[PDB]
Amino acid sequence: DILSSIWTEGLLMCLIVSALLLFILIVALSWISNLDITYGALEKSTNPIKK
Amino acid sequence: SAMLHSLRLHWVESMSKFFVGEGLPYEPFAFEYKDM
Amino acid sequence: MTELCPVYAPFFGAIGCASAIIFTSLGAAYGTAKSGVGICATCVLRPDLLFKNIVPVIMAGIIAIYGLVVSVLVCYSLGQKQALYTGFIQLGAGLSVGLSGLAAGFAIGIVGDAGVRGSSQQPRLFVGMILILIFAEVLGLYGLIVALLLNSRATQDVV
Amino acid sequence: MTELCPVYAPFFGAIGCASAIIFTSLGAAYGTAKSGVGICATCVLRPDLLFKNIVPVIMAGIIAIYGLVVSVLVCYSLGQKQALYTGFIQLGAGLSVGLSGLAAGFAIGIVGDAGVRGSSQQPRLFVGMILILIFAEVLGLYGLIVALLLNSRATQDVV
Amino acid sequence: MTELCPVYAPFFGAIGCASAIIFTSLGAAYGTAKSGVGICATCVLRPDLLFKNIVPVIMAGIIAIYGLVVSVLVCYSLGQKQALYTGFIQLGAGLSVGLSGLAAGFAIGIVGDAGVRGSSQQPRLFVGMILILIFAEVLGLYGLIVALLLNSRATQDVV
Amino acid sequence: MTELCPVYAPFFGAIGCASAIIFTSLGAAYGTAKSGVGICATCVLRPDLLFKNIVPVIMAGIIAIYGLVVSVLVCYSLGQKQALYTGFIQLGAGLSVGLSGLAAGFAIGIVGDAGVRGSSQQPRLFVGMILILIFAEVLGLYGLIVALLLNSRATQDVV
Amino acid sequence: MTELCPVYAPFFGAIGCASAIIFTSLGAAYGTAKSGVGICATCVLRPDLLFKNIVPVIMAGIIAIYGLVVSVLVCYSLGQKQALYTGFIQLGAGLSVGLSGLAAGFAIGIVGDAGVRGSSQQPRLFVGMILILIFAEVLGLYGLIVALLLNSRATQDVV
Amino acid sequence: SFSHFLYYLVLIVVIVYGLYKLFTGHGSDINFGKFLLRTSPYMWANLGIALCVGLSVVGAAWGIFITGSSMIGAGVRAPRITTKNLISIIFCEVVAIYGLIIAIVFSSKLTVATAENMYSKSNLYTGYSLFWAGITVGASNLICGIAVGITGATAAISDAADSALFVKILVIEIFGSILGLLGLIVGLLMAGKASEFQ
Amino acid sequence: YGIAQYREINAGLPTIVTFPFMFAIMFGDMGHGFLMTLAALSLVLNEKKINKMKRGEIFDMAFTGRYIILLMGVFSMYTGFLYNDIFSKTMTIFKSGWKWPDHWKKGESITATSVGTYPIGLDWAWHGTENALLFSNSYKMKLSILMG
Amino acid sequence: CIPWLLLVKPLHFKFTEDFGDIMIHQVIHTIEFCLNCVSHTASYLRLWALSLA
Amino acid sequence: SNIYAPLYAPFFGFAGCAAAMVLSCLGAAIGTAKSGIGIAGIGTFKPELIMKSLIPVVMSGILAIYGLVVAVLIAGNLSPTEDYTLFNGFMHLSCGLCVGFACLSSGYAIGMVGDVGVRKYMHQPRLFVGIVLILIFSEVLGLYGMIVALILNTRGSE
Amino acid sequence: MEGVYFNIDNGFIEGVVRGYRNGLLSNNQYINLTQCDTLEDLKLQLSSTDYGNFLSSVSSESLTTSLIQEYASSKLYHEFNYIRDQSSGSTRKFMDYITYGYMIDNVALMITGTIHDRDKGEILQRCHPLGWFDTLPTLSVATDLESLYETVLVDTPLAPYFKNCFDTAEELDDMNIEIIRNKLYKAYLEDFYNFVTEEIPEPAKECMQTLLGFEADRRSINIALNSLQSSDIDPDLKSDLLPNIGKLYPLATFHLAQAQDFEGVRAALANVYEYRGFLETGNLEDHFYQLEMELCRDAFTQQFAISTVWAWMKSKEQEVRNITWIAECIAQNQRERINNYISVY
Ligand SMILES: CO/C1=C\C(C)=C\[C@@H](C)[C@@H](O)[C@H](C)C/C(C)=C/C=C/[C@H](OC)[C@@H]([C@@H](C)[C@@H](O)[C@H](C)[C@@]2(O)C[C@@H](O)[C@H](C)[C@@H](C(C)C)O2)OC1=O
Ligand SMILES: CO/C1=C\C(C)=C\[C@@H](C)[C@@H](O)[C@H](C)C/C(C)=C/C=C/[C@H](OC)[C@@H]([C@@H](C)[C@@H](O)[C@H](C)[C@@]2(O)C[C@@H](O)[C@H](C)[C@@H](C(C)C)O2)OC1=O
Ligand SMILES: CO/C1=C\C(C)=C\[C@@H](C)[C@@H](O)[C@H](C)C/C(C)=C/C=C/[C@H](OC)[C@@H]([C@@H](C)[C@@H](O)[C@H](C)[C@@]2(O)C[C@@H](O)[C@H](C)[C@@H](C(C)C)O2)OC1=O
Ligand SMILES: CO/C1=C\C(C)=C\[C@@H](C)[C@@H](O)[C@H](C)C/C(C)=C/C=C/[C@H](OC)[C@@H]([C@@H](C)[C@@H](O)[C@H](C)[C@@]2(O)C[C@@H](O)[C@H](C)[C@@H](C(C)C)O2)OC1=O
Ligand SMILES: CO/C1=C\C(C)=C\[C@@H](C)[C@@H](O)[C@H](C)C/C(C)=C/C=C/[C@H](OC)[C@@H]([C@@H](C)[C@@H](O)[C@H](C)[C@@]2(O)C[C@@H](O)[C@H](C)[C@@H](C(C)C)O2)OC1=O
Ligand SMILES: CO/C1=C\C(C)=C\[C@@H](C)[C@@H](O)[C@H](C)C/C(C)=C/C=C/[C@H](OC)[C@@H]([C@@H](C)[C@@H](O)[C@H](C)[C@@]2(O)C[C@@H](O)[C@H](C)[C@@H](C(C)C)O2)OC1=O
């Protein structure tokens, strides 16, 4: 009465814990990638009529 | 962090008990040195 | 190899220690990046606020301190022959502090960017920005506290 | 082989070393690419600032050094018959340093890009950018510290 | 247990009831929302359109009645020592009624939104809109018929 | 629990029972929704065309009839102890009719919305619209024929 | 059952019979929908070409005939005692004809839409579109030929 | 989309594996019952606690930044609204407080159990109860924090224009916080009968 | 936070003591509290010169609240005494109420027995023990509940 | 006391359109009071949390 | 021991208690947020009508009460020292899924109706009856889900 | 949903823009400005508003209606550029697309001055400073549209909008520049509508789709009426001038293309109920501006929507127009129609 020969209870627990951690990591990496630098205030205004 | 958390505990947890608020601040007509 | 102390038990402790710093560093990096964008945007117009507006970057870095503290404290109970209970305690503490620090760092980054961009225009908003940033950092503090509570039970009555 | 020293134990150590170098290289590459974009965009109008703006690149390039140091230190503890605990520790240390240095490189690339772009018109923003970028190099340092602390326990009291 | 009546047999019946409720509720909600947005958009201009446009909402609400009827029947047909043939029949009936009602609700929502947005001009569009809404509701009625025909055979000649 | 007639055999029959009316209802709903959008868009220009432009909705509704009849033929050929081959045939017939009716409904909607849109401009476009709608309905008729032919083999020389 | 003729062998045959009509109907639906919207757009201005530009719809409607023919010839060669060789051959023929007819239908839809949208500009575009549709229908013809050959070898020297 | 393709491939692989196990006669080999019985309830309890606190903090931070961005944006012209709309941030952080309390309560039940009674009925029930109650509290606090943050952002933007808007949107924000309160109540109710591991 | 009503109970009178004391409860360190006290005293004793000279935004702040910081530092020193936390260490000023066993082997888990009560502050026998957190956490949670 | 605090003051105001405003404001005050009772008592645990941190 | 009451049944029993509360909270939050957005929008121009415009919020909050009731009844049948049959666990999971997703659908519908219902009620009060009827039609979905959950748990207990 | 992901990047932008909307003058402030006596009194009254002391540096004798308009426009454009410079990504692209509309008008005005040989200083002053590509002052000399495109328009982000204008004659005149402006702005409207549909999320997507449809209908009507007086207009070629994203498309746009008379234009517009009354009676531009203000007010009802930026910009452009009108009426003392201002807040 074992869970599996290769997909043992310990291996499945480790795999799904790592899956949860990797899901959180992937979400965080998507957040960090979606971060965009606001270039408007980091450049010199090229308008002579105004500013 | 502790200073500002005690600020929070006084503004929310403490003042809401007895602070009616919405009072007129005292701004008297006084002369002061206005920096240029 | 004991039923109470499997050979994969140290995996949970090691991965929790790794996650405690990984997710807190990710959140701190997001906060630092967003607050740096805000600070560099505002300093072109108000260079005098360069050192006053660095607070969001500082408070983003405290999350990394919380993650480092949990990672250091988890390594105390790490061992080859450790129980599965200890391993899952370590994993739970690491996950708690990591996810809490990630959320806190994201919130600190967003609110710090908003506050630095809005305090140059209105100097009265510095107090509000600092307050909301403290409210965001106390979340990582709560994750730290939960991690410490879990760690206090790591190696007690364990055989 | 042995229950405590399985044949697949070196897999986790090799993955840890590979991740330690790889993710730090990715973070350093992102930082270097974005900071170099900033420098090349800003140097078109400020020939005096060819240098003094490569500091984001330099700090991004130390993250790769952290990953290299961790990878070198976990290679020397890698063996054919090594405990699964040692493999888990090496994997955790590698993941911690790599995924902390990746976040550090992201933050450095964003912050240094913003700082160099602002500094093309405001020379006072250089100091602010230098201080803010240290707040991500310190995240990389925290990850390195966690990785070294883990690796110190890789072979300590291991059978 | 029994080969024909395993312990996990009512899982399929429970999943069928859940699918019926879930999908009929999503269909009804989508229909009601897509009808109500047009109701608000168009009823501002005319007085007599308050009940000209409640017909899509009434039609979409009957889908939830179909889901309720099928789910109540399969609940009354559920059992502990229940053969998995009954579980499969209940799962099929729940899936059929739920997804047919989901399709009917989506069609009702789209048709109601379009007809209400286009019917503010003249009230002669009302008859055609009613006809098309009936056409869309007949899909949910067919799903109900299939589910009832299934549930009539759920516990017929079952050992 | 005969190998040729396993216990789980009615699962595929129930899935075909559901899918014959689930996907046909999905296609009918798509066709009805798109055609109704077109009609209600074109109802304002001419109210007399409303009774002639409902043909796409009518032909979209015949797909649901095909699914319903294929189900009623399939859904009455189930049993506690049915062959796995019979379950496979029922599932195949259900999938064939459902995913042919889904395509027929998709084509009917896409053709019919444009057809009723053009009918407000060209009154003689009605014959071409009817032709293309017949062409799209034959696609679901083919799936109906395939399902009917399969169902003749469900319990033919089956032990 | 025999190791060469398992009880799950009819599953592949049923799936192939279903797919042979499902995917050909999907391709025919695409090639009929795009052709029909193009035909309606053309007929909005001039109805003279309405009955002449139906060639793309007819060509996409022959793909469904190929799928129906393959499904009919597959549902006759499959039984309860058929081997895995026969089931795999039937599945391969069904997938071949279905996923070749789907590509043929996609190409026919695109080509016919372009040709009927540009047909009012040049009468010779009708002949050009006919020529390109001849090339696009031959893809489905090849899929049908492959399916027919497979089904010919489905029950030859099979035990 | 790469993510959609990965999801579809995972679904196809799962379906193919299930059909292969079922057809060959090894359908019972995919046993979720043995997976749940042989899994250490310490895993479930610790995952429940960690996810409870993590998702509570995630929701608190979510509401905090949604409200704070709007408060700072509307404070540029009306700085007086920050102190009055700090109640919104308080209502966003109270869900983190709820998650912390639930985590404390659940961690009070983390006792070392003997090897023979490792997977007993009481221990398995405790593991499942802690896992699912932590999931419930964490997800409820996440949802409540997001809703309260949205409501607080609207309240700050509206009471920047006129201070009378805050006293009417605070009702909606209290309605939002009620969701987190109910989540805490249900999480406590689930783990009320769950005794410590023994 | 807001301006009080006319002839309303001022919130600034109880704040003088409550705010530094809640900060001290959260802070709770006699070494860090001493550093805060010295930092505030540097401003307090030299307040005439700082008043005469111009102050920045960060310098005008923390100088108008120099007495605030002084009170927080003094109360932090008091709480750190009550926590026996001097730079994260402990002061063995009085006699502990816990007695360790007469003799034990190295590395053996030992539980102290109660002999009395610690006069002022947390017992210093709780420093470095395995169940130090289990006691300090309950103490501080109940302290927070009571003082709230 | 919950119905007491929710009703007695509006009842006195009724028995001395403003009545509806007073009644609604008293409802809002009552609900906020009951919520922030447990909210404030729970949030005072931040003293322990920050001390531990 | 008991073949029909395995020790992993409480997992599925609590999965219905978790799903019910979580999805009811999701639906209630969606309704309350999407109604508060519209209320705030109309407040800038017509703040006087906010008083009666809270109806979508209050009836989207009742969905959370439905989920709370169902979760309370589900969790009352779960106890470590009690034969919790796998039938009961599966059917309580069905309770939770049914009521949670019905309340989520009701919350989505109430949000989409109150987002534009109050934004068009500000123009004239004559649309109030129509908006209330549409909101009732949205709430009866959660009512049906709660009724199904009640029937399910009542039958599962016995 | 709507506000779940908005405040990550645009929360501060939305807050500041809605505060700016709160800063828009109400009816009472408009009446107070109407009751002024001189431009100095108007400046003093505007000081009490949210304009602040924007005319503080201006002396009493230098105070003029043109200068008041210049300062109000400068403040508005400074606010817009500050908001753009605090936003990135989709919001930054949205702001750039907003600027492109003024940039097209700027290039058209520069070309009109180039053929008209007007004063360079006044030509620069009249140009809208929001739409300013680096080669804009080059337009004062360049005339050939092929040379125009190759030396200027490829450099600008207006390059994708110049596709089908090569068919016309190479020599450029007033009719050529008018049709080039119409074609360029139509292509810009199509590109902006596509960008809103794909990238701008709900509910800002639908709101800006409706707003762009209104703008397309407005300019379609304007183009049809301005080409009605001309006898060199081809009905099929006019389809390249009328935008295809508005509510008029496709039937009403087709009828307008085939419309040749004012009654024909009214019959073409009979498909849409909103635009029938605009040509039925009254001032057409007044009705367009009133409905634009109503649409902006409706746009400000939605929270967590980036369309509030467009609503604000149109509202405060109309506000600056109203301030200029009031100042001119006060300076000329012709207060017969001083109350002919459009306000919704
Ligand atoms: C290079 O090492 C600096 C920071 C690093 C790397 C800290 C790590 C431990 C970090 O990983 C941790 C996690 C965060 C931390 C412990 C920040 C404290 C920073 C110092 O602050 C006292 C500043 C501070 C001296 C400096 O930032 C400013 C000059 C300033 O003094 C200007 C003042 O106007 C302002 C009031 C004051 C405020 C914002 C603290 O900062 O030192 C530094 O830069
Ligand atoms: C040639 O590649 C350079 C370094 C390499 C290969 C580093 C790797 C080993 C990497 O693994 C990392 C980055 C190791 C590291 C930390 C190197 C520091 C290098 C010096 O940085 C101080 C500059 C320095 C000699 C000089 O190149 C600078 C540009 C500069 O002379 C310009 C000055 O204006 C400026 C004030 C100052 C620095 C601080 C910018 O020194 O060496 C280089 O560039
Ligand atoms: C609001 O639903 C009413 C009761 C509810 C909530 C029933 C739920 C169980 C329902 O959710 C479920 C889904 C069943 C359902 C759908 C009932 C419809 C009832 C009537 O609907 C015809 C209206 C009907 C009296 C009234 O609501 C109509 C608006 C109307 O009065 C307007 C008239 O102009 C019109 C001629 C006529 C109908 C045919 C449009 O009746 O009873 C109601 O009170
Ligand atoms: C909504 O209830 C209607 C049909 C239902 C419920 C069908 C289901 C059973 C479904 O399973 C399918 C679709 C089978 C079916 C039985 C269709 C019959 C349609 C009727 O057509 C005879 C029209 C027809 C009476 C009506 O649509 C028009 C008044 C019209 O008579 C106008 C004529 O100008 C036109 C020539 C004629 C054409 C288009 C058929 O339709 O009934 C309806 O709508
Ligand atoms: C009603 O049965 C029609 C289509 C169906 C159901 C086909 C299935 C059996 C399918 O399995 C396929 C498509 C079999 C197939 C290939 C049928 C061809 C039928 C007739 O084609 C001769 C046209 C034809 C009468 C009609 O389309 C036009 C009026 C036309 O006669 C106009 C002529 O100007 C033109 C020369 C001629 C050409 C294009 C073939 O078509 O009937 C139909 O629609
Ligand atoms: C913050 O929520 C409030 C109480 C809470 C938390 C109830 C939960 C326990 C809920 O789960 C319970 C179970 C159900 C519920 C939802 C009660 C609503 C009561 C009042 O709603 C009428 C509102 C409040 C909206 C009310 O005071 C409004 C001002 C008003 O009276 C204004 C009237 O113009 C309007 C006609 C009337 C409508 C909604 C009937 O509501 O009391 C509150 O403070």
From Swiss-Prot, chains C, D, E, F, G:
It is found in: Vacuole membrane. The record marks E137 as: Essential for proton translocation. One of its GO terms (biological process) is Golgi lumen acidification. SUPFAM superfamilies: F1F0 ATP synthase subunit C (SSF81333). The keyword Ubl conjugation does not apply. Residues 32-53, 113-124 are cytoplasmic. One of its GO terms (cellular component) is fungal-type vacuole membrane. The chain crosses the membrane at residues 9-31, 54-74, 91-112, 125-150. Residues 1-8, 75-90, 151-159 are vacuolar. Keywords: Hydrogen ion transport, Ion transport, Membrane, Transmembrane, Transmembrane helix, Transport, Vacuole. One of its GO terms (molecular function) is proton-transporting ATPase activity, rotational mechanism. It holds the Pfam family ATP-synt_C. Its main location: membrane. Gene3D superfamilies: lithium bound rotor ring of v- atpase. Signal peptide: none annotated. It comes from the Eukaryota. Belongs to the V-ATPase proteolipid subunit family. Proton-conducting pore forming subunit of the V0 complex of vacuolar(H+)-ATPase (V-ATPase), a multisubunit enzyme composed of a peripheral complex (V1) that hydrolyzes ATP and a membrane integral complex (V0) that translocates protons. V-ATPase is responsible for acidifying and maintaining the pH of intracellular compartments. V-ATPase is a heteromultimeric enzyme composed of a peripheral catalytic V1 complex (components A to H) attached to an integral membrane V0 proton pore complex (components: a, c, c', c'', d, e, f and VOA1). The decameric c-ring forms the proton-conducting pore, and is composed of eight proteolipid subunits c, one subunit c' and one subunit c''. This is V-type proton ATPase subunit c. It comes from Saccharomyces cerevisiae (strain ATCC 204508 / S288c) (Baker's yeast).
Swiss-Prot record, chain H:
It is a multi-pass membrane protein. Residues 21-46, 107-129, 190-198 are cytoplasmic. GO terms for biological process: endosomal lumen acidification; Golgi lumen acidification; proton transmembrane transport; vacuolar acidification. It holds the Pfam family ATP-synt_C. SUPFAM superfamilies: F1F0 ATP synthase subunit C (SSF81333). One of its GO terms (cellular component) is Golgi membrane. The chain crosses the membrane at residues 1-20, 47-67, 86-106, 130-150, 169-189. One of its GO terms (molecular function) is P-type proton-exporting transporter activity. Residues 68-85, 151-168 are vacuolar. Keywords: Hydrogen ion transport, Ion transport, Membrane, Transmembrane, Transmembrane helix, Transport, Vacuole. The record marks E93 as: Essential for proton translocation. InterPro entries: ATPase_proteolipid_c-like_dom (IPR002379), ATPase_proteolipid_csu (IPR000245), F/V-ATP_Csub_sf (IPR035921). It is found in: Vacuole membrane. Belongs to the V-ATPase proteolipid subunit family. Proton-conducting pore forming subunit of the V0 complex of vacuolar(H+)-ATPase (V-ATPase), a multisubunit enzyme composed of a peripheral complex (V1) that hydrolyzes ATP and a membrane integral complex (V0) that translocates protons. V-ATPase is responsible for acidifying and maintaining the pH of intracellular compartments. This is V-type proton ATPase subunit c''.
Curated annotation (Swiss-Prot), chain J:
It is found in: Vacuole membrane. Disulfide bonds: none annotated. The chain crosses the membrane at residues 1-13, 31-53. Belongs to the V-ATPase 116 kDa subunit family. V-ATPase is a heteromultimeric enzyme composed of a peripheral catalytic V1 complex (components A to H) attached to an integral membrane V0 proton pore complex (components: a, c, c', c'', d, e, f and VOA1). Present with 55714 molecules/cell in log phase SD medium. This is V-type proton ATPase subunit a, vacuolar isoform.
Swiss-Prot record, chain L:
SUPFAM superfamilies: V-type ATP synthase subunit C (SSF103486). V-ATPase is a heteromultimeric enzyme composed of a peripheral catalytic V1 complex (components A to H) attached to an integral membrane V0 proton pore complex (components: a, c, c', c'', d, e, f and VOA1). This is V-type proton ATPase subunit d. Subunit of the V0 complex of vacuolar(H+)-ATPase (V-ATPase), a multisubunit enzyme composed of a peripheral complex (V1) that hydrolyzes ATP and a membrane integral complex (V0) that translocates protons. V-ATPase is responsible for acidifying and maintaining the pH of intracellular compartments. This subunit is a non-integral membrane component of the membrane pore domain and is required for proper assembly of the V0 sector. Might be involved in the regulated assembly of V1 subunits onto the membrane sector or alternatively may prevent the passage of protons through V0 pores. Gene3D superfamilies: ATP synthase (C/AC39) subunit, domain 3, V-type ATP synthase subunit C domain. One of its GO terms (biological process) is Golgi lumen acidification. The modification N-acetylmethionine is found at M1. GO terms for molecular function: proton-transporting ATPase activity, rotational mechanism. Keywords: Acetylation, Hydrogen ion transport, Ion transport, Membrane, Transport, Vacuole. It is found in: Vacuole membrane. It comes from Saccharomyces cerevisiae (strain ATCC 204508 / S288c). Belongs to the V-ATPase V0D/AC39 subunit family.
